[PDB]
Amino acid sequence: TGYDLSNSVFSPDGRNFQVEYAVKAVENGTTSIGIKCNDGVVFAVEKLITSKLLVPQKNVKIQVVDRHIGCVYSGLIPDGRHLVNRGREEAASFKKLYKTPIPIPAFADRLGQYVQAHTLYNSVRPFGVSTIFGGVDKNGAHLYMLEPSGSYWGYKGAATGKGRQSAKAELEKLVDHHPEGLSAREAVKQAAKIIYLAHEDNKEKDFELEISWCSLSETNGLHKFVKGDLLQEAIDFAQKEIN
């Protein structure tokens, strides 16, 4: 052994243990999710209130890339910020040469290739985040989830972090109960509920809900934060279902 002491080393069963250990940091993070709706995507995340002294609404976690893409992650927050900074550079350079804003699948591979690059050498460490991201491009809505290995796929709904199992089952019900699809507004409400449900595995502390969305009809295909009345209404709808 000693195969797990250095990144990019294959174990005798063909595994990269440092990547698997990165996944442990992800599983240790707060719960974050995304829901692909009819003409858009919704992102939501649980923010643990470690103390009264945290200024409410003020430690924003969901991040915009370009103007049409939202990103949320669980695990090591700084790693996620590093990945989004890179994503912002990739989006800028794509738009600079090709004019059109980067399509979501194209953007997914940019993040994927970069994250995968950090599994090729022992001089770097893998990313300790799983990232849920997406938005609207010329072919419609797209939701993706990307892991520390560089692995990503497109999703109907996605979840990561500590309450991932609970969120998944919730997400599966929605897929079954709505083959035609979910409206963006329905998706916001559902996202609030699912984060409330998943917060059981994290019940020690209270939390603060944070939601965002990009919808062709509701935001003109731009990424926006769900604030004020529409946020409250989703918090209320969530409170009801956990009661």
Partner: protein, 233 residues
Amino acid sequence: TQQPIVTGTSVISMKYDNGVIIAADNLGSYGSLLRFNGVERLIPVGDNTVVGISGDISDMQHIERLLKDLVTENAYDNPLADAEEALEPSYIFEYLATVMYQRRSKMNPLWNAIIVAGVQSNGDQFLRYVNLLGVTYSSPTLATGFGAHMANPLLRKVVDRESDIPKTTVQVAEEAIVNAMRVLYYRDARSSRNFSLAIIDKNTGLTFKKNLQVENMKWDFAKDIKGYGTQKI
């Protein structure tokens, strides 16, 4: 070092009691060939700023992309991007001025003259100029190119000094601006009849007018002009 190829002529502007006005025609010339006839040279940034650009059009299109990218970037990790941490006219200007001077210092200028017109958070009018050399200045009226020679004299009769600004209504200022545009159309060989005009008012926000035309033109007196001295017929 280069040379301008496709070019835009004057940008003109002035302050009035509640804001600023800026105007520029819609032509892109190719030397003396009036090549392109629907070029927008006023580029709004948010709802408080309009950047008007003359000179090389390829460089204008580059600057326009820089400004668009500025807006994208300012919104990053910025919950107050549409409130207290929106871009101000003064931020946009200082950035452009930095870029212009840097480019001149590398002997590779952006071949333009630029006027940034807007209204600050506190309601203050903003009007300032920068060009390919990195030279900057402010005045109650500003104009580039021919506009500096013909528009400024007219605009300065309305606002001649700082104390004239609060006495100048948006109606008087706009009419002054529109007249100056007619005069430039008479006398500038690289001007066009079609122009855009933007008003940034601290109360009514940004009004952006496209497809304006020079009208009320005096040509009738030309019928009486014969020869170049002695000819009667």
